[PDB]
From Swiss-Prot, chains A, B:
Function (record text): Plays a role in signal transduction by regulating the intracellular concentration of cyclic nucleotides. This phosphodiesterase catalyzes the specific hydrolysis of cGMP to 5'-GMP. Specifically regulates nitric-oxide-generated cGMP.
Expression sites (tissue/organ): Expressed in aortic smooth muscle cells, heart, placenta, skeletal muscle and pancreas and, to a much lesser extent, in brain, liver and lung.
Name this protein carries in UniProt: cGMP-specific 3',5'-cyclic phosphodiesterase
Originating organism: Homo sapiens
Domain GAF: 4-144
Full-protein positions shown: 346 to 509 of 875
From Swiss-Prot, chains C, D:
The name this protein goes by in its record: cGMP-specific 3',5'-cyclic phosphodiesterase
Ranges in coiled-coil conformation: none
Written domain comment of the UniProt record: Composed of a C-terminal catalytic domain containing two putative divalent metal sites and an N-terminal regulatory domain which contains two homologous allosteric cGMP-binding regions, A and B.
Post-translational modification: Phosphorylation is regulated by binding of cGMP to the two allosteric sites. Phosphorylation by PRKG1 leads to its activation.
Tissue occurrence: Expressed in aortic smooth muscle cells, heart, placenta, skeletal muscle and pancreas and, to a much lesser extent, in brain, liver and lung.
Domain GAF, chain residue ranges per copy: 8-151
Recorded family membership: Belongs to the cyclic nucleotide phosphodiesterase family.
Primary role: Plays a role in signal transduction by regulating the intracellular concentration of cyclic nucleotides. This phosphodiesterase catalyzes the specific hydrolysis of cGMP to 5'-GMP. Specifically regulates nitric-oxide-generated cGMP.
Signal sequence, start to end: none
Length: 150, 150, 156, 156
């Protein structure tokens, strides 16, 4: 049914982004019931958000970069089951994990993930997702380092 | 150099989104010069934006859905070289193309693309991109229709 | 429940191989899962590959005459798609069955073949291989139109 | 300028085949570009494929003993990676060269092999095949750790 429709939409966006070299794609599907509206609105984006002049410094100050510094700033996963209801900071569930380096020198990046979903609804990130993300950034860290030293 | 670094970042985000079933991913790379800031911030997302109750009707009214209705509402590509400087509507370059149906029955969707880029900078969408997008949505339209009738 | 964990795994294996290929720049990836039931064997061997088969500059005239390029040849000269249900059972071209759908890629003006798209073994959710149907044929006919444009922009 | 349009094309061809595979659910895609220089031949044949090779339930014990599963076997029993520069030139395992990097996938606790990752033909920008180096080996060693977790979550 619509699960199949929601899968094509993903494919179409990823494909168009690949072939055209655009940052954003949105697929609007005319709602069959209300022709004025959209039954599905599938969105995707890819972007390098900083090509500036530390102007990048001041961008870190911003409220959506919060959790990133919090994790760079702890060396430890941050896990927020429902963000609307959360009381440590002034879009729903969020996992965010330090990308560390080769021989645990220090921290070289952060993975934020937003809205784990159900294979369904939006969901919290569990200890098992954490463990998976932790194993994932190991190779990432090692890939990121190669693209400079070489 | 950083072009290679900007490519890994894309791969990492697409991969993490694939494996974890999240909507948003952001890869922060600690700026080597200012440890407080981010040298790169690579962002990606995938989302179904409407699972509601036409509540979807009122969502069409919104200012970022503008151009979508404009194209549903014309049957013709819309092409805006620099949006900040544009005078037809109250993020920069934008192409937006109707997804039509099998035997040109009517319109079943819209592709918005934002920010063509250079293989470099952000760029306008040309007549050639249009022609390419026009040929692209033909198979899309035919794929979208299959996931309902079947 | 136990066929539900196996379709799962295939998905992961494909993701794995696609991910590693993309990151590593290799032509071929094969992931073997050791059979839990006895450790001397593999319960899954998931293969994926990616490569350009014509790295030679003529010497291609000879290669084009290979047995495995016949469908391609047939579609190119004929200028129309070819649909075979079971490549073995077929009589004009000299168990587990194989299905084939081969479609021409044309120039905008549709009077000349500029390439060909050959697809093998349409699949069902972990289902068997099946024949390509008319929607399949319809769909690919629409798909190669934008392929032609892509390709042509590239040969500038 | 004219080798610049050819690396371009390979990129498009890979994108095409990946796109069509993904949309169509087929195991194999081959895109042929008709040689502009003479229409009887193909100047590019870009192949990509995707499939599970063990669809049988024992009968796998026999399959695991195939010649093309030896590296896999060797890595699994040995429990450590295997790196071959030119699979032909190599003497323990019974031109255009082939390079091979095969790494074990382990359980969290690292005392048992649960699968194996075999990579073939590391490539250079349209460059030739080359040997896998130590970074290659380092990188894959880090990559399979998360593979193990993925796989295991799947076998619940």
């Amino acid at each position: 049914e619509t699960a199949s429709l929601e899968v094509i939409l993903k494919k179409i966006a990823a494909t168009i982004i690949s072939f055209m070299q655009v940052q954003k794609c949105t697929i609007f599907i005319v709602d069959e019931d209300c022709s004025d509206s959209f039954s599905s609105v599938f969105h995707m984006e890819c972007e390098e958000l900083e090509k500036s002049s530390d102007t990048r410094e001041h961008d870190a100050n911003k409220i959506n970069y919060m959790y990133a510094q919090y994790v760079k700033n702890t060396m430890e996963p941050l896990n927020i089951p429902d963000v609307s209801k959360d009381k440590r900071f002034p879009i729903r569930s969020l996992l965010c994990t330090p990308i560390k380096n080769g021989k645990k020198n220090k921290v070289i990046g952060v993975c934020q993930l937003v809205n784990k979903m159900e294979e369904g609804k939006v969901k919290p990130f569990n200890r098992n997702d954490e463990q998976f993300l932790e194993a994932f950034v190991i190779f990432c860290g090692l890939g990121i380092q190669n693209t400079q030293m070489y």
